[PDB]
Amino acid sequence: SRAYGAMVSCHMLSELEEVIQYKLVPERREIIRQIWWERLQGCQRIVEDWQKILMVRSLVVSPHEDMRTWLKYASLCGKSGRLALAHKTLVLLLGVDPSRQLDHPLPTVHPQVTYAYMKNMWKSARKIDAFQHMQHFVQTMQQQAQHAIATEDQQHKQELHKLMARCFLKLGEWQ
Ligand SMILES: O=P(O)(O)O[C@H]1[C@H](OP(=O)(O)O)[C@@H](OP(=O)(O)O)[C@H](OP(=O)(O)O)[C@@H](OP(=O)(O)O)[C@H]1OP(=O)(O)O
């Protein structure tokens, strides 16, 4: 447990070598990203360590390029009593600020990011407006899914149904 800090340092150095591999090899990009995700999952859930590792990985990977990792990091920060940093990460992922445009409904692009932002807002005690955004998001998801159902997009439809199931459960619990 004492050496874990130096272990984190070794993790960062190994990540840097995999970063130069990422820059050199264009066919290794997906494999490297999956390796990074699994290794980060293996590491401990300390916000400082996660921030260091993600800062190292940011050299060749923009947050938009890998939404899942930053979503997990934002969830960790939210559970670690750092809702300010979690909101900053969520707004960076979204690309626009829902806080300034309260009247403007939440963007539908990146629905996972929108759902994460909504639940963070719920944790931010803005429950009523979170519920209104939840209803708007669910109706938008259903209309979008009905419009965009196609034989080509089936995995996307399955993921959308899973997210919608989570949204309906959250709607019921919040009601
Ligand atoms: O913190 P909660 O409100 O209870 O939400 C949890 C939490 O999601 P986050 O990734 O946003 O933290 C779980 O993640 P863990 O931190 O426990 O790893 C996730 O489970 P997975 O990691 O397996 O995705 C689970 O999702 P699910 O209900 O689909 O299993 C999800 O629950 P809600 O989305 O219903 O809030």
Side-chain angles (χ1 to χ4, degrees), residues 3-175:
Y4 176 74
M7 296 305 302
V8 170
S9 296
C10 301
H11 190 304
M12 305 261 287
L13 303 170
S14 58
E15 285 292 77
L16 222 62
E17 288 194 348
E18 287 184 321
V19 171
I20 68 179
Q21 259 200 48
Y22 198 87
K23 278 191 174 182
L24 261 58
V25 192
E27 63 269 21
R28 200 84 203 282
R29 308 295 177 84
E30 288 81 44
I31 299 94
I32 288 296
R33 277 204 315 274
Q34 176 62 30
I35 297 172
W36 289 2
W37 171 249
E38 176 60 273
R39 201 180 294 166
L40 178 58
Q41 252 52 49
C43 180
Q44 200 174 13
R45 305 190 64 88
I46 276 300
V47 164
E48 292 80 327
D49 308 337
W50 278 56
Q51 176 211 58
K52 288 182 176 182
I53 299 179
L54 295 203
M55 256 170 51
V56 162
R57 296 178 182 180
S58 69
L59 293 169
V60 291
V61 174
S62 60
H64 296 272
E65 182 186 352
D66 187 5
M67 172 274 316
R68 167 190 52 183
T69 294
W70 288 97
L71 210 70
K72 194 70 170 186
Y73 173 59
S75 173
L76 184 67
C77 291
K79 280 196 290 294
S80 297
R82 204 174 301 190
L83 284 313
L85 195 148
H87 198 291
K88 134 184 169 178
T89 307
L90 257 313
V91 75
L92 181 136
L93 262 298
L94 289 162
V96 293
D97 296 60
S99 55
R100 57 180 60 185
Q101 293 179 338
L102 295 168
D103 305 321
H104 156 251
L106 303 183
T108 317
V109 292
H110 311 296
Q112 208 86 29
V113 185
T114 296
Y115 163 64
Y117 178 80
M118 264 184 296
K119 60 194 300 184
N120 169 74
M121 162 183 290
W122 172 270
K123 286 187 173 59
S124 303
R126 308 197 293 267
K127 305 175 181 171
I128 283 81
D129 52 80
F131 206 109
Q132 298 287 3
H133 287 303
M134 204 65 175
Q135 301 276 32
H136 150 66
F137 177 82
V138 166
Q139 291 149 8
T140 309
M141 208 302 302
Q142 287 296 344
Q143 70 88 13
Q144 166 269 352
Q146 168 268 344
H147 147 79
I149 280 170
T151 317
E152 187 70 48
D153 283 15
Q154 282 297 94
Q155 63 288 306
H156 169 70
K157 179 169 187 51
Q158 191 175 13
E159 151 63 36
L160 232 49
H161 273 308
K162 166 60 183 166
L163 181 59
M164 171 46 61
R166 294 199 229 169
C167 295
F168 268 139
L169 186 64
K170 280 300 182 178
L171 267 172
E173 295 177 348
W174 294 352
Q175 187 177 185

